[PDB]
């Protein structure tokens, strides 16, 4: 049934990757876009996302699916706005994308926009889905 949430997030052509990852007990990808990046998220990576250090990945960044990202704004554990904004550290090459990780009770909804898509658009999309998820006890 989780297949429909990825299709939902990707239905309007503005995103290039999306994933719903469970983080309680044993982190695992419940659904992700195939052949992409988030599908390869590891439990160690999820660890950093929900970790205690909230101002260390700020100068050293972090990775999602092997991909190095830059934390631009962190409010993942903040009451109300349980979101985090990142850009794709295209330290090499050029292409950069906006990413948003949103947290619910049992999951993390991840979203990556296509080249040039406005960050708040990706933030809105990611945030509203997680809002739906937590109201449904997820």
């Amino acid at each position: 049934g989780w297949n429909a949430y990825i299709d939902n997030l990707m239905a309007d052509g503005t995103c290039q990757d999306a994933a719903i990852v469970g983080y309680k007990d044993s982190p695992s990808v419940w659904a992700a876009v195939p052949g992409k990046t988030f599908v390869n998220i590891t439990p160690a990576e999820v660890g950093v996302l929900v970790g205690k250090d909230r101002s260390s990945f700020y100068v050293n960044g972090l990775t999602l699916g092997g991909q190095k990202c830059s934390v631009i704004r962190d409010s993942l554990l903040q009451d109300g706005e349980f979101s985090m904004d990142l850009r794709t550290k295209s330290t090499g090459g050029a292409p950069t994308f906006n990413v948003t990780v949103t947290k619910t009770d049992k999951t993390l909804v991840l979203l990556m926009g296509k080249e040039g898509v406005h960050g708040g658009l990706i933030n809105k999309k990611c945030y509203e889905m997680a809002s739906h998820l937590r109201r449904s006890q997820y």
């Binding site: 049934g1 429909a4 949430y5 695992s28 419940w30 889905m129 739906h132 997820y138």
Partner: peptide, 9 residues
């Protein structure tokens, strides 16, 4: 988002 899917499996 649609209805909540079943647990993983």
């Amino acid at each position: 988002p649609p209805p909540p899917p079943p647990p993983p499996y």
